Amino acid sequence: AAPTAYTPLDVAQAYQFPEGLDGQGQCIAIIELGGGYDETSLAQYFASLGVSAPQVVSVSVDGATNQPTGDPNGPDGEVELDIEVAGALAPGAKIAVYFAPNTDAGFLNAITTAVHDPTHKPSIVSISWGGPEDSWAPASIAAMNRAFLDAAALGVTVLAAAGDSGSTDGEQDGLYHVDFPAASPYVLACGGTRLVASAGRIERETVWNDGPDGGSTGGGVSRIFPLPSWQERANVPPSANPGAGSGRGVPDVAGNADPATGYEVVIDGETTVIGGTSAVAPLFAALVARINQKLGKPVGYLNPTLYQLPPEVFHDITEGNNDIANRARIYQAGPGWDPCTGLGSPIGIRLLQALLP
Amino acid sequence: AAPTAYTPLDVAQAYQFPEGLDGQGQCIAIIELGGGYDETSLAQYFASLGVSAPQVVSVSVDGATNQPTGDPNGPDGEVELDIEVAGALAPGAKIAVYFAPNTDAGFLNAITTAVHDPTHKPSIVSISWGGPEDSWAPASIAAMNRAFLDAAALGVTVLAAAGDSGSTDGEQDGLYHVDFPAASPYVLACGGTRLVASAGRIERETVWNDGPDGGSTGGGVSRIFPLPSWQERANVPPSANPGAGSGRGVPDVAGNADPATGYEVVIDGETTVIGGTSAVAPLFAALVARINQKLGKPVGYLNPTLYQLPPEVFHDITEGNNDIANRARIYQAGPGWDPCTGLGSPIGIRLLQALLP
Ligand SMILES: [Ca+2]
Ligand SMILES: [Ca+2]
């Protein structure tokens, strides 16, 4: 019950990230709609972990720029968490941070700008911003989903945090909701767990659920995207919302997100702990950068492949639920894919081995 | 009964430290967060014991310096005890004393400065400062623990006193607590005993427990660090705190710490007796310096090896408990590893014999 924290290297070790690979030759794009980062925090942090610091550059979209507010509890926490987690684990990769206005067009423009960027040429895009899929204008959902389909066609992996307010995703309208962009079938949706691990083993990994006050992983069944062909054997349940419905199941994978077993980071000069699914997209972006480095070619769109890989590639989470609204336990983890943690946490070395011919 | 005192050489003889070795060629780093030493007490002391005085140098971390307050009952007692015990027993070693501000960053920076020091190049770091593991900010525990993981990877042994306020570690919150850094699985946690010995034999060795007013050795079960793989056969009991979880057992080894059978030292020119687990980390740091001298390479991280060594390498403490809060005898010593004294007191020559191929 005592709160703990890990450096990103400890979590990568627990998930058996492949050794001897650092993302050299890869560029990870990170999307930001507010805040900024300062070089002092990044340099202190990377030095503290003993890793050669990755090059980090900012890209302005629609007039937005890298502008830290200086408040460790503000958006700088998101920006610096993203860079510190991805950068500490794929320090050989180049990191390009795209800043855009916090509008639907700005979010879309940041994604399309990164995906098609001929200067930075990212092979991976990490996204830790989002909102309930049914709170978005339908036109915006369509445009962003098409941008993600385009990234898949181009061989660019797009990862997105699944949410921090459980199965209701922050809405109090008597229904369950999944977050977008995680709900897009073209995005690798990243859920969250409470991880108890040491260098040699995972002692326990359960659904992240700290109640209404502490947050919980997003997850559920989309009301907008049909169940994908490649997800039809995952046993995604019907939606818990009356009238139910078959839909794309969220998330696809999951990793440590509980702030109570969180990430030690340096935000605006302050050493602290941050969690949330915001950390999981950059964590797995670094894993993908390592895998791409070894393969010599980008894995791009991974979802169809992940769902047909052998079970041994994942650590199945089976205990917990992501309900923070009521006592119904919607949804619950269980054997195999579930709407709290998807396929579970990847075992890095096994995922790499499964992707090599 | 009657209070006694030993010179450090008498304790080393009781524990059969290997003869003919003095740590020549080694450097022992000693971390300090306050106080200071004066050459007069040190020169007087080493000369008085007939050992060639080791070179002792101070290193300033974050602007902190060697600043004795002159009060023999103040922090100078800690600084001078550490140097006098380690230096008297490994006089051939060079001693580097790192002074840092008494803050979480200062403690961390002293440790990383010493571990990575290209000028002093210590192979051993002795720490006699600490606090309840759950009283520390989780981010600081994570940073500190990773610094100790780094030291293990680099072949640097890190030893820490387990505490002087029994199984509750100075807290009055109805819970039992272990001290950090001793709780880190990467640190050799040093507990305390009451030793009745002469040059040729140990007549009695029991858990150090002089009640609330006299102090008692720290020890117990971590609420933060899982039970290490190498410690799973030690029979660490479930924690006495509610939930009765499994966790890293403290301490790993133990040595004389009872002030009533304490160490005769000279603090700020005053010849006196000082005990506590503060003395045990420097005592065993000197043992490790002698062993490193003989092996020709540093033993570095010792914990995994210690727990699989033959039982004859240790003197098993089986009598006593470290409870100074109530009558429950939590925790209690017994055959084999226990949460008061760990594997017991090392038998120097046997430990050295076991480490040579
Ligand atoms: Ca599952
Ligand atoms: Ca024992």
Q: Where are the domains of chain A?
A: 1-357
How near does any CA of chain B get to the CA of A344, in Å? Answer: 22
d(CA A341, CA B101): 44
Best of A9, A10, A45, A48 to disrupt the B interface (most B CBs within 10 Å) is: A48
Q: Does A53 touch chain B (CB under 8 A)?
A: no
User: CA separation (Å) from A92 to A22, A54, A97, B100, B200?
Assistant: 5, 6, 16, 33, 59
Annotation marks residue A82 as catalytic: yes
Q: Where are the beta strands (DSSP E) in chain B?
A: 4-6, 27-32, 56-60, 94-99, 124-127, 131-132, 157-161, 179-180, 188-197, 202-207, 220-221, 249-250, 253-256, 261-267, 270-274, 314-315, 345-346
| Residue A184 Cα to ligand 1 middle (Å) | 21
- Whether residues B139 and A199 touch (CB distance < 8 A) is answered with no
What Rg, from alpha-carbon coordinates, does chain A have? 18
What string of H, E and C letters represents the secondary structure of chain A?
CCCEEECHHHHHHHCCCCCCCCCCCCEEEEEECCCCCCHHHHHHHHHHCCCCCCCEEEEECCCCCCCCCCCCCCCHHHHHHHHHHHHHHCCCCEEEEEECCCCHHHHHHHHHHHHCCCCCCCCEEEECCCEEHHHCCHHHHHHHHHHHHHHHHCCCEEEEECCCEHHHCCCCCCCCCCEECCCCCCCEEEEEEEEEECCCCEEEEEECECHHHHCECCCEECCCCCCCHHHCCCCCCCCCCCCCCCCCEECCEEEECCCCEEEEEEECCEEEEECCHHHHHHHHHHHHHHHHHHHCCCCCCCHHHHCCCCHHHEECCCCCECCCCCCCCCCECCCCCECCCECCEECHHHHHHHHCC
Q: Which of A344, A90, A30, A41 is nearest to A208 (CA)?
A: A344
State the nearest Cα–Cα gap between A233 and chain B, in angstroms: 36
B43 touches chain A (CB under 8 A): no
Query: Is A128 in the active site?
Result: no
Instruction: Residue A73: count other Cβ atoms within 10 Å of its Cβ.
Output: 12
Give the closest residue to B207 by CA, choosing from B106, B114, B79, B334.
Answer: B334
Q: Rounded to an integer, what distance in angstroms lies between the CA atom of residue A23 and that of residue A286? A: 7
Ligand 2: centre distance to CA B9 (Å): 24
CA of A315 to the centre of ligand 1 (A): 8
Output the DSSP codes for B284-302: HHHHHHHHHHHHSS-----
Which secondary structure element, helix H or strand E, spans residue B341, and what is its range?
none
Greatest CA separation for chain A = 54
Interatomic CA distance for residues A110 and A102, integer angstroms: 10
CA distance linking residue A321 with residue A333, whole number of Å? 6
Give contacts of B 267-286 with A, CB under 8 A: none
CA distance A15 to B183: 24
Q: CA-to-CA distance for A86 and A117, rounded, in angstroms?
A: 19
**How far A210 CA sits from the closest chain B CA (Å)?**
17
- A10 interface with B at CB cutoff 8 Å: yes
Q: How many C-beta atoms lie closer than 10 Å to residue B64's C-beta? A: 22
Report the candidate in A351, A352, A349, A353 with the shortest Cα–Cα distance to residue A16. Answer: A349
Sheet holding A261-267, edge to edge: A4-6, A261-267, A270-274
Chain B residues in contact with A262 by the CB 8 A cut-off are: 138
Cα gap A215→A179, rounded to integer Å: 14
Task: Report d(CA B278, CA B15) in Å as an integer.
Answer: 17
What residue in B sits closest to A203 (Cα-Cα)?
A: B226
Maximum CA pair distance of chain B?
54
State residue B292 phi and psi, 5-degree precision: -60, -40
CB distance from A262 to chain B under 8 Å?
yes
Provide Rg for chain B, Cα atoms: 18
**Ligand number with the minimum distance to the CA of A319:** 1
Query: Does A212 sit behind a cis peptide bond, omega within 30 degrees of 0 on the bond before it?
Result: no
Distances A261 to A7, A192, A202 between C-alpha atoms, Å:
10, 11, 13
The candidate with the shortest Cα–Cα distance to B281, out of B254, B309, B302, B304, is: B254
Identify whether the C-beta of residue B344 lies closer than 8 Å to the C-beta of residue B314: yes
Query: Which residue of B lies nearest to A263 if distances are taken between CA atoms?
Result: B139
CA nearest B65: which of B28, B43, B97, B27? B97
> CA A180, CA A163: separation in Å to the nearest integer?
9
- Whether B105 has its CB under 8 Å from any CB of chain A: the answer is yes
Q: How far apart are CA B193 and CA B258, in angstroms?
A: 6
Provide the 3-class DSSP secondary structure of residue B315.
strand
Q: Tokens 């007069």 belong to which residue?
A: B40
Helix, strand, coil share (%) of chain B residues, nearest 5: 30, 20, 45
What separation in angstroms does the CA of A190 have from each of A130, A165, A182, A352? Answer: 12, 14, 7, 18
For B46-97, give the DSSP string. Answer: HHHTT-PPPPEEEEESTT------S-TTSHHHHHHHHHHHHHHHSTTSEEEE
Count the neighbouring beta carbons within 10 Å of the beta carbon of residue B314: 22
CA separation for the pair A280, A282 (Å, rounded): 6
SS3 state at B306: helix
Specify the residue for token string 């709609």. A33
**CA A341–ligand 1 middle distance (angstroms):** 6
Whether A196 has its CB under 8 Å from any CB of chain B: the answer is: yes
Q: Which residues pair with A265 in a beta bridge?
A: A272
Local structure of residue B261 (DSSP, 8 states): E
Number of H helices, E strands in chain B: 9, 17
End-to-end CA distance of chain B: 44
d(CA A256, CA A252): 14
| Contact between residue A179 and residue A225 where contact means Cβ atoms under 8 Å apart | no
Distance from the Cα of residue A315 to its chain's centroid: 17
Report the C-alpha gap between B56 and B150 in whole angstroms.
25
Specify whether the CB–CB gap between A26 and A90 falls below 8 A.
yes
Cα–Cα distance, B121 to B33 (Å, whole number) = 20
Helix axes B75-89, B280-295, angle to 10 degrees: 30
Measured CA to CA in angstroms, residue A194 lies from A1, A344, B16 at distances of 12, 12, 47
Measure A337 CA to ligand 1 centroid, in angstroms: 5
- Partner-chain contact A273 B143, CB within 8 Å: no
Q: Cβ contact (<8 Å) for A198 and B134? A: no
Chain A residues inside the 8 Å CB shell of B225: 198
- Which residues in chain A are closer than 8 Å to B185, comparing Cβ atoms? 198
Question: Do B24 and B293 contact (CB within 8 A), yes or no?
Answer: yes
A353 C-beta neighbours (distance < 10 Å), count: 13
Q: Verify whether residue A58 is a known catalytic residue.
A: no
Report the distance separating Cα B142 and Cα A6, nearest Å: 5
Q: Are the beta carbons of B320 and B340 closer than 8 angstroms?
A: yes
CB B104 within 8 A of CB B64: no
- The answer to whether residue A19 neighbours chain B at the CB level (below 8 Å) is no
* Centre of ligand 1 from the C-alpha of residue A182, in Å: 18
Residues bordering ligand 1, an ion, CB closer than 5 Å: A 316-317, 338
A273–B141 CB contact, under 8 Å: no
Q: Is B229 on the interface with A (CB under 8 A)?
A: yes
- From B123, B128, B239, B278, the catalytic residue: B278
Q: B202-207 and B188-197 as β-strands: parallel, antiparallel, unpaired?
A: antiparallel
Q: Which residues of B touch A3 (CB under 8 A)?
A: 138
Query: Do the beta carbons of residue B88 and residue B20 sit within 8 Å?
Result: no
Kindly identify the ligand whose nearest atom is closest to the C-alpha of B207.
2
A50: amino acid identity, one letter: G
User: What number does CATH give the domain A1-357?
Assistant: 3.40.50.200
* CB–CB contacts below 8 A, A to B: 54
Asked whether B95 and B126 are in contact (CB, 8 A), the reply is no
Which residues in chain B touch residue A200, judged by CB atoms under 8 angstroms apart?
Answer: 229
Burial environment of residue A244 by CB neighbours within 10 A (0 to 12, 13 to 18, 19 or more): exposed
DSSP class of residue B269? Answer: T
Q: Which of B104, B105, B141 sits opposite A5 (nearest CB)?
A: B141
Tokens read off for A49: 């972990």
Q: Output the CA torsion sign for A35, A36, A42, A44.
A: negative
Catalytic residue among A78, A179, A252, A268: A78
Measured in Å, how far apart are chain A's first and last C-alpha atoms?
44
List the structure tokens of B31. 């971390």
Would you give the DSSP letter of residue B226?
A: P
CA B316/CA A32 separation, integer angstroms: 59
CA of B313 to the centre of ligand 2 (A): 13
